[PDB]
Design a protein around this ligand. Sequence first.
Ligand SMILES: Nc1nc2c(ncn2[C@@H]2O[C@H](COP(=O)(O)CP(=O)(O)OP(=O)(O)O)[C@@H](O)[C@H]2O)c(=O)[nH]1
Ligand SMILES: Nc1nc2c(ncn2[C@@H]2O[C@H](COP(=O)(O)CP(=O)(O)OP(=O)(O)O)[C@@H](O)[C@H]2O)c(=O)[nH]1
Ligand SMILES: Nc1nc2c(ncn2[C@@H]2O[C@H](COP(=O)(O)OP(=O)(O)OP(=O)(O)O)[C@@H](O)[C@H]2O)c(=O)[nH]1
Ligand SMILES: Nc1nc2c(ncn2[C@@H]2O[C@H](COP(=O)(O)OP(=O)(O)OP(=O)(O)O)[C@@H](O)[C@H]2O)c(=O)[nH]1
Ligand SMILES: [Mg+2]
Ligand SMILES: [Mg+2]
Ligand SMILES: [Mg+2]
Ligand SMILES: [Mg+2]
Lengths: 426, 426, 428, 428
Amino acid sequence: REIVHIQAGQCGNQIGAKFWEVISDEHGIDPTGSYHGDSDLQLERINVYYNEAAGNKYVPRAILVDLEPGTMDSVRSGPFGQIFRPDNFVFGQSGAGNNWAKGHYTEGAELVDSVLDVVRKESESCDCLQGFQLTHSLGGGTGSGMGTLLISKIREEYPDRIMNTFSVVPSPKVSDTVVEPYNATLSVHQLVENTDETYCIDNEALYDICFRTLKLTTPTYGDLNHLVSATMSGVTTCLRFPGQLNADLRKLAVNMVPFPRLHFFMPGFAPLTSRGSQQYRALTVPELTQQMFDAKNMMAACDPRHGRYLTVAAVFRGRMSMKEVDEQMLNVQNKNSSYFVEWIPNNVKTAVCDIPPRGLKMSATFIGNSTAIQELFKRISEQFTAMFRRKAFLHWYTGEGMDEMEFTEAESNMNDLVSEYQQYQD
Amino acid sequence: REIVHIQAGQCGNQIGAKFWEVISDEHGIDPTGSYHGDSDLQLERINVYYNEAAGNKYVPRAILVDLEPGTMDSVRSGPFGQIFRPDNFVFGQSGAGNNWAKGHYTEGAELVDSVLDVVRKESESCDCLQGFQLTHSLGGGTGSGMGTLLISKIREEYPDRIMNTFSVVPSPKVSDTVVEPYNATLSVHQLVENTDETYCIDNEALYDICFRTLKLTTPTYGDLNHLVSATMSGVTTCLRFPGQLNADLRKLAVNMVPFPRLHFFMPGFAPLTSRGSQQYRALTVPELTQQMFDAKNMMAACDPRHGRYLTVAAVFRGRMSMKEVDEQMLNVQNKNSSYFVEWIPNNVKTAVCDIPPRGLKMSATFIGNSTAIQELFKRISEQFTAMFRRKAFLHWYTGEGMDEMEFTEAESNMNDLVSEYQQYQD
Amino acid sequence: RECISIHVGQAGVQIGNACWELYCLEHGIQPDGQMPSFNTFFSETGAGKHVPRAVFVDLEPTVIDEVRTGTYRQLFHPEQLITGKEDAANNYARGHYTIGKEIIDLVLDRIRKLADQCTGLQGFSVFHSFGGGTGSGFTSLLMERLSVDYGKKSKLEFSIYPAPQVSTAVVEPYNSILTTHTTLEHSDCAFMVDNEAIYDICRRNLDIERPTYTNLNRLIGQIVSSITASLRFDGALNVDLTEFQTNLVPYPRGHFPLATYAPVISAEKAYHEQLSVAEITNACFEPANQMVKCDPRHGKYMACCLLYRGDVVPKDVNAAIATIKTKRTIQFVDWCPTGFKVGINYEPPTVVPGGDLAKVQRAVCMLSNTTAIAEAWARLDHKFDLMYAKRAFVHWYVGEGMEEGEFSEAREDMAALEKDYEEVGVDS
Amino acid sequence: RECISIHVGQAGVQIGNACWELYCLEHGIQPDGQMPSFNTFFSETGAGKHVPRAVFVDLEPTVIDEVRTGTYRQLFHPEQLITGKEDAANNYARGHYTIGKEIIDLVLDRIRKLADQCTGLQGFSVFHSFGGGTGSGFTSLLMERLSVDYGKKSKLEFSIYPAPQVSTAVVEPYNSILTTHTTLEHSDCAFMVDNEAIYDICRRNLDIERPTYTNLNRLIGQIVSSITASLRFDGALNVDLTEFQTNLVPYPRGHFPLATYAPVISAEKAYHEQLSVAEITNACFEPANQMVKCDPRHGKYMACCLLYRGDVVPKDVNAAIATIKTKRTIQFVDWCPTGFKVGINYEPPTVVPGGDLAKVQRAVCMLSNTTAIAEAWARLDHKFDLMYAKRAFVHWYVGEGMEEGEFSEAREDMAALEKDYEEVGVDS
Ligand SMILES: Nc1nc2c(ncn2[C@@H]2O[C@H](COP(=O)(O)CP(=O)(O)OP(=O)(O)O)[C@@H](O)[C@H]2O)c(=O)[nH]1
Ligand SMILES: Nc1nc2c(ncn2[C@@H]2O[C@H](COP(=O)(O)CP(=O)(O)OP(=O)(O)O)[C@@H](O)[C@H]2O)c(=O)[nH]1
Ligand SMILES: Nc1nc2c(ncn2[C@@H]2O[C@H](COP(=O)(O)OP(=O)(O)OP(=O)(O)O)[C@@H](O)[C@H]2O)c(=O)[nH]1
Ligand SMILES: Nc1nc2c(ncn2[C@@H]2O[C@H](COP(=O)(O)OP(=O)(O)OP(=O)(O)O)[C@@H](O)[C@H]2O)c(=O)[nH]1
Ligand SMILES: [Mg+2]
Ligand SMILES: [Mg+2]
Ligand SMILES: [Mg+2]
Ligand SMILES: [Mg+2]
C-alpha cells in the first residue's frame, strides 16, 4: 500500500512542499515529524506516505531532486524540511537551462542514477508499493527532462505499480521560455507511453480561481500550489482513511482510462470560494456538485463543455449519504448529458470516504477526462511548429545532441493524441 | 412555490431595497439574515423568497443588477445588504445613458448573460418555481432596456412560470429625459408580448398620496418606494401565509386577464392616511373598501372612473369575516356598476388571508384592470410621436444601431393596446 | 355498512375539518385518536387509536399543511394527507387534467386501501366546490375513476354553489358547467349548497353579525352527519343510502335534491322556544331556512324525505305530514303521488363546544327533489353566455388544451337537464 | 442443521456486519462473545463464548481492519478475518484469478475448519456484489472450489445488483456478466437486490431523507434472518432450505427468485397502523415494496413463497392467498399450477436499537420466481453491448490475461438465460 513521491524541479519542489505540509496536517504530524494527532486513523495508514522513525517520528517517503542547490535549500529551510531526511536530497549544481536535452538526455541522467538507487532503497523499505507520484513541470529542464528520465527507469523496474504524475501545463499567457513548447513536446512524447496517468494543471486557470472565486488580488504560488495540493491529497484520502467507495488508485485508473493512450486528466475542486460568501454557504452535495461541475472551478485550463466526457470521477470527503451523492451525480449526467459521450452509460463514478478535510465538513475532488483537453495539446503543438519550422533555438538542443527527428516524432505522437480524442469525441 | 426577484436599475434597486426590507420584516428576519420571528408561519413559507443558509440564516432569492457600481454599493451598504450574497451583485461600469439601445440592445446584453446564469443557478436551487418578479423603470436604460432583455430570456426558458413586473411609469410632470418616451415605447412593445402582467405605478400619483393623504410636506423616494413595497408584499401574503382565498398568483392571473394582451394593472392601497386622523379611524371592511375604491388612493396615475373595469382584485389581510368582505365588495360593484363592464358579472374577486401587516389589524390591496389605463399609454405615445417625427435625439439610438422601423412598430403595438382597451370599454 | 369520506380542495377539506371534528364530538374521540367508545367511519388500530376513513387532497400544499398543523393531525393518517405543489388556478383544465392527472393515481390507490379496509362499504361521500379547480376539475377526474372500480357504490356529492355574491373566479360559470356534466355522468346524488343562503340563515336565525366559513361549515357538517351518522346509529326507522337512491331519483337524471334544515336557532333565541316535530318541519318547509338560493314555493315537489334526530314520535310526524299536505303549498307532481319518506333515529343532535346553535332535543333534515332547482341552473347558464359571448378568459383553458366545443357541449347538457326538470314537472 | 456465512468484499462484509449484529440482537449476544442463551450460527467454546460461523474476506485490508476495530471484533475469531494487500481494481480478472487466487486456499481451508466444526451442515450463504472485484470475481473462484468439496450443500447467494444510478465501475456490466455465468454454474439460488429500489422504499415507507448503506444493510439483514433464523428457530410450519430448492427451481436454470418485504414502515407511520396478515401480504405483492428494480405486474409467476414471523394464523394466510389469487394480477404460468408455499414461525420480528423501522408483531418475506427478472438482464446486456462495441477498458482485463471470447461467451450465456425465462413463461 505505499507510495513513493518525487519532487522534481522548482515546481515539483514547491508544490510538493505544500503537499507534504498538507499530508502531515492530515495525520497530525508536526514539522519535527512527531505525531500529535487526533485519531487512530491518522496513524492507521500513515505508512502510505511515511516511515516510522525511532521515537514516533515520521519520515516522508519522498525524494527531493533538482540541479540547483538553492531551491533545495530553501525547501529544506522551511517547515518540513526538518521532516525530510538528508538521504532524500539529491542535487547538482548547475541548472539545465530549461533544456530537456540537458536534463533528460545528458546532465540530469547523471543524478537520476543516484535518485533511482534511493528510490530502490525506499521501495525495499516498503511492504508493498502501490505506486509512485511525481510532481514536475512540463516545460522545465529537470521537471520535464530529468523527471521523464526517472519515470522511464522507474516504470521499467516496477511495471505493475501506478505511475502517476502531476504537472504544470504551459499557456500562452504564462510562457517563459521560447523553447518551453519544445520541452513540453518532448516530455509529452515520453509521458504518453510511460505513465499511467497525468494531471494537467494550468497556472492560468489557477490564477482565475484565485481571483474570481477566491477573491484574491495577488495570486501567489504559495496559494496556487496550495490548491494543487488539495487535489493531490484528495485522491488518496480514501486510501489513507476508511470509507465506502473506491479507495484504491488502481480502481480509479481502471474506471478512468477507456483507452491506453488517453490518460490525461482535468482536476477540479469544491468548495472553492472566498470567506466573504462562506457565511451564506450551505454545503450540500448538490452544492459541491454544482461547483465541481462548473468549469470555472477546474484547475485545468480547459472547459469540458467544449468537448465531451469520457470519464468523471468524483471523490467525496466527509459524512454524506449514499443517496444524496449517487442521486445528485447521476443527475449531473442527466442534466448535462449533451456533454457526455454515449459510449459509457453511467459516466460518473464516485468515491466516498468518511474523513473530511480539516476545516471543512465536506469536500469534493473532481477528476475529468474530456476530449476538450486536446486544446491544451493544440496550444503546445502549434507553438512548437512555429519554432521548429525555423529551427529557432534548436541549436541549443542540437548542441546537446538531439536529432531533428527526435522532435519530429515527438510531435507526431502529440498529433496522435489529439486525433484519438477526436475519434472518441464523436 | 418559489419566486426569483430581480432588481434592475436604480429604481429597481431602491424599490427592491424597500421590498426586501419589508419581506424580512414579515418573517422576522433581521439584517444579518438571522431568524427571530414571532411565528412558525413565518418560517413555513419562507422558501418562496429565501434560501436557508447554514445557521438559520436566510438569503433572499434575488439578483441585483445594474451598470453603475455606485448604486449597487449604496444598496449593499444599507441594512439588507448584508442579507444579500455577493453572488447576486451583477454589474458593469458605465451606465446606459438612458438608452434602451445601450441597455437592451448592446451593453446590457453583455451582463444579461451572466445574470441569466445566476438566475438558472437559483432556479435550480428551488424546488419548484412559481414565478419571477422584476422591479424596474419604464424609462431608463437598464430598467427598461436591460430588464426587458432579461425578461425575454427568462420567459424563453420558463414558459409556464409567472412573469410579473412592477414598473415606473412616466408622467408629464416627472419626465427627465427627452428620450424617456422612446425608451418607454420600446419597452412596452416588448413587455406586452413577453410578460404575464405588469403593474403601472406613477410617481406623480404617489406624490399626491404622500401629501394629500399622508400629509407629508416632503415626499421622498424612501417613502414612495415604501408604498410600492406595501403593494408588492400584499400580493404574496396569502401565498406565504395561510388563508382562505386565492393564494396563488396564477389564480389571480386567471381571474385578472380576460384577454392575452391586456395585462397592465392599477395598484392601490388601504388604509392609507396620516396618523393625525388615525385616532378617528375605525377600520372595518367598508372602510377599507371605501379607500381602495377611491381613485385618490391608487398608485397608478389614472382614475378608473374615467374608463370601465374589466377586473378587480382585492386582497385582504387580517381577520375579517367572509360576509363582511364579500357583501361589501359586492356592494361596491352594485353601487358603482356604471364603472364596470357588463361582460363580467361579478367583476370583483377577493382574496382573504389570515395574517395582517405588522402594525395594522387589517389591510387591503387593490388591483385594478380598467380601460382608463389607456390614458397613460396616450401620454407616452403622443410624446413619442412628437420626437419621432422630427427624429430629435434619434441619432443617439441609431448610433447604437436601432432602426426607425423598430420604433415605428413599437408604436404600432402601443396603438393596438389602446384600441383593445377601447374595444373592451365599450 | 361503512363509508369513506373524500375531501377535495379547500372547500372539501375545510368542510371536512368540521365534519371530522363533529364526528369526534359525536363519539368522544380524542385528537390523538384515542377513543373510548363509530365504526362506520373509523377503523381501529391495535393501539386503540381510531383512524378516520377519509382522504384529503389538495393540489397546493397550503391547506393540507393547515390540517397537518392542527390538532386533528394526530387523528389523520399521514397517507391520507395528499398534496401536490401548485393549484389548478381555478381551472378545470388543470384540475381535471394537466396537474391533477399527475396525482390522482396516488389518491385512488389510497382509496383502494381504505376500500380494502372496509368490509362492507356502502359507499362514499365527496366534498368540493363547483367553482374551484381542485374542487371541481380534480373532482371530475376522481369520479371518472371511482365509477370504474367501484361502480355501484354510493356516490354522494356535496358541492358548493357559487353565489352571486361571492365570487371568486370570473370563470366560475365555466368551471361549474364543465363539472356539472361530469357529475351528471357519475354521481348518484348531488347536493349543492349556496353559501349566500346560509349566511342569511346565520344572520337571522343564528343572529350572527359576521358569519365566516368556519361557522358555515359547522352548520353543513351537522346536516351531513344527520344524514349519515344517523343512519349508522340505529334508531326507529333507519333509512339506508340505497333507499335514498331508490326513493329520491325518479329518472336517471334527476339526481339533485336540495337540503333545508331546522332548528337553526341561536341559544338566545331558543330560549323560549320549544319546537314540536310539526313546528320544526314547518320551519323546514320555509324558503327562509333553505340552504340553497331558490324559491321552494315556486317549484313543485317530486320527492321529500324527512330525517329525525332525538325526541320524535311517528305519530307526531304523521300529523306533521298532514299539516304539510294541507297547509301547503307543496305542489307535488302527478308523477309521484305521495312521496314522503320518513326516517327516525333516536340519536340526539349534537352540539359543538363553542358553537353557535342552541342545544336541541330534536332535529330535522329535509331532503327534496323540487323543480325550483332549475332556477339556479338558469342563473348559471346566463352567466356562461355572457362570458362565452365575448370569450373572455377562454385562453386560460384552451391554452391548457381545452376544446371550444367542450364548453358549448357542457352548457347544452345543462340546458337539457333543466328541460328535463321541466318535463318531469309537467303533469301528466 | 447448521450453516456458514461467507462475506466477500465490502459489500459482503458490510452487509455481514449488520447480519451478525442482528444475530446478536436476536439472541442477546454480547460483543465479547458472551451470551447467555443459536446454534446454527454459532459454536460455543468452553468459555461460554460464542463464535460466528463465518468467514470474512477482503483482498484489501481496509474493510477487514474496520471489522477488527469494531465492537464485534471480539466476537469474531482472528482466523476468520482474512485479508490480502491490494484490491482487484474492480476487476474480475484479478478477483477471480490474478490476486484472489493467491488467497483463496487459505479461505477454503478456514471454511473446511468450520465445515468440520459443524455436525450437520445444511449449507451456506454468501454475500457479495455483482460489480465489484473481490465481491464478484473472487466469489466466482470461491464457488468453483466450494462446489467441489461440498457439492450438494446449499449454495445461497446474495448479490448486489448494480443500479443505473449507482455506478461505481464503468466495467460493471463486464464484471457482472462474467460473474453471472459462474453463479449459474455453481449456485443453487441467487438473490439479486437493487440498492436503488431499496432507497425508494427507505425514502417512502421509512420516510428517510438520506439513506445510507448502513440503513440499507439493516433492511436486507433482517430479510435474510427471516429466511434463515426463522427456519432454525422453530415454529408452526418450518421450511427447510432444501424445500426451497425443491419448490423454487423448476428447471436447473431458473434459480433466480427475487425478494420483496413488508412491513417496511417507519415508527411514525406505523402508528396507526395495523396490518393483518392479508394486508402485509398485499404489501408484499406491490411493486413499490419490491427490493429489485423491475415490474412484478409485467412478469408472470412461477413460484412464490411466503414466510411469516410472529403473530400469524394459517387460516388468515389461507384467506390472504385467496385474495392474492383473486385480486391479483398474479399471472401464474401454466407450468405450475398453484405454487404457493407457506412457512410460519412463531419467532417475532426483531428490532435493532437505533433502527429505522417500527416494532412489528408480524412480518412477511416474499420470495418469488417471476419472469420479470429478464428485464434486469436485458438492461445489463445492453450496457455490455455499448462498452464492448467500442471495447473501451477491455485492456484492463485482457492485459490481466482474459480472452475476448470469454466476454462474448458470458453475454451469450445471459442471453440464453433470459430466453429460458421466456420459454418457461410460455404457457403451454
Ligand atoms: N503552479 C506552479 N508552476 C511553477 C512554479 N515554479 C515554476 N513553475 C512553472 O514550471 C516551469 C518552469 O519550471 P521550473 O522551475 O520547474 C524548471 P526546473 O527548475 O524543473 O528545471 P531547470 O531547467 O533546471 O531550471 C514553468 O511552466 C513555470 O512557469 C511554482 O512554484 N508553481
Ligand atoms: N418611485 C421611483 N422612481 C425612480 C427612482 N429612481 C428612478 N426612478 C425613476 O425611474 C426612471 C429613471 O431611471 P433609473 O434610475 O432606474 C435608470 P436605470 O438606472 O435603470 O438605467 P441607466 O440609463 O443605465 O441609468 C425615471 O421615471 C425616474 O424618474 C426611485 O427611487 N423611485
Ligand atoms: N361552505 C364553505 N364554502 C367554502 C369554503 N372554502 C371555500 N368555499 C367556497 O368554495 C369556493 C372556493 O373554492 P377555492 O377555495 O377557490 O378552490 P378549491 O375548490 O379549494 O380548489 P383550487 O381552485 O384549485 O384552489 C368559493 O365559492 C367559496 O365561497 C369553506 O370552508 N366552506
Ligand atoms: N447494500 C449494500 N450495497 C453495498 C454496500 N457496499 C457496497 N455496496 C454496493 O456494492 C457495489 C460496490 O462494490 P465495491 O465496494 O466497489 O467492491 P467490492 O465488491 O467490495 O470488491 P473490490 O472491487 O475488489 O473492492 C456497488 O454496487 C455498491 O452500491 C453496502 O454496505 N450495502
Ligand atoms: Mg531550476
Ligand atoms: Mg443608473
Ligand atoms: Mg385550494
Ligand atoms: Mg473492497
